[PDB]
C-alpha cells in the first residue's frame, strides 16, 4: 500500500514532514508541558476526516487519553471553522481513557476489532492517537531497575502500535512530555515569543529548519 499523508493544518510543518504525518508510521511529538502537543492532536483528529484533496484521508479516529485532556468542544470548534459538521466529525472519533499502562496496552489490542470493522467502509480508521504515550509508564515504572523494565514494556506497546499502523495503513500519533526511542519520526515542539509554536525534526538526517505556527480557532495554522 502507498503511504497516505495527513496535513497538520500548518503548511510549514507539513513541509518539514514531506506532506503530512504518514500512515504506516508512528510520529511522536515531544516537548514541555504547555507546548501545544494536545492541540496538534486535536487538529489532526479533524484534518484526517477531510477528503484527500484537502489534506485528509476520509478517515475515522481512535483516541486513547491518559490525562483527561481530550475536549469534544475543541473538536467541534476546529471542525466548524474548517467547513465540516461538528457533530459528524465528533461521531467518527472513538474515545478511551486509559486507567493505567496495562489498561493502555489492552485498549490498543482491543482497537484492532473496530479497525477491522471499518476497514472496507467509506471511513476506515486512518488515525490512532495516544496522549500521553508515556505518562503512565513514567509513574508506574520508577526507581532502581525500572529503566530497563520500563523501556521493555514501552517497546512492546510500541511494537503493537507499529503492527496496527502497517497491517491496516494507519497513521499513529503519540505525545510525550519532556533514553532510546522507537518512533518512526520525532518532532520537538516548544513555545515561542508572542504566542508562537516552533516545531523541529529530531535525529532525522529529512528537511532541516523549523516550522512556526499559531494555535487558532482552526486548530493550528501558519
Amino acid at each position: 500500500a502507498t503511504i497516505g499523508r495527513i496535513s497538520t493544518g500548518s503548511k510549514s510543518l507539513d513541509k518539514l514532514l514531506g506532506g503530512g504525518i504518514e500512515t504506516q508510521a508512528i510520529t511522536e511529538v515531544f516537548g514541555e508541558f504547555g507546548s501545544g502537543k494536545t492541540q496538534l492532536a486535536h487538529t489532526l483528529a479533524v484534518m484526517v476526516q477531510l477528503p484527500p484533496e484537502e489534506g485528509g484521508l476520509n478517515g475515522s479516529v481512535m483516541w486513547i487519553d491518559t490525562e483527561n485532556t481530550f475536549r469534544p468542544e475543541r473538536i467541534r470548534e476546529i471542525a466548524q471553522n474548517r467547513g465540516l459538521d461538528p457533530d459528524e466529525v465528533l461521531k467518527h472519533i472513538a474515545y478511551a481513557r486509559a486507567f493505567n499502562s496495562n489498561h493502555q496496552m489492552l485498549l490498543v489490542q482491543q482497537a484492532e476489532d473496530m479497525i477491522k470493522e471499518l476497514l472496507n467502509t467509506d471511513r476506515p480508521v486512518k488515525l490512532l492517537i495516544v496522549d500521553s504515550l508515556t505518562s503512565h509508564f513514567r509513574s508506574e515504572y520508577i526507581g532502581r531497575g525500572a529503566l530497563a523494565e520500563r523501556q521493555q514494556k514501552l517497546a512492546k506497546h510500541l511494537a503493537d502500535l507499529h503492527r496496527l499502523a502497517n497491517l491496516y495503513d494507519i497513521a499513529v500519533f503519540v505525545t510525550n512530555q519532556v533514553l532510546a526511542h522507537s518512533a518512526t519520526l520525532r518532532v520537538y515542539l516548544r513555545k515561542g515569543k508572542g504566542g508562537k509554536r516552533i516545531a523541529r525534526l529530531i535525529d532525522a538526517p529529512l528537511p532541516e529548519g523549523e516550522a512556526v505556527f499559531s494555535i487558532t480557532e482552526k486548530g493550528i495554522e501558519d
Binding site: M62, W63, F70, P72, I75, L90, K91, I93, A94, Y95, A96, L107, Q110, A111, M114
Partner: peptide, 4 residues
C-alpha cells in the same frame, strides 16, 4: 472504548 466509546464514541466521542
Amino acid at each position: 472504548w466509546h464514541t466521542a
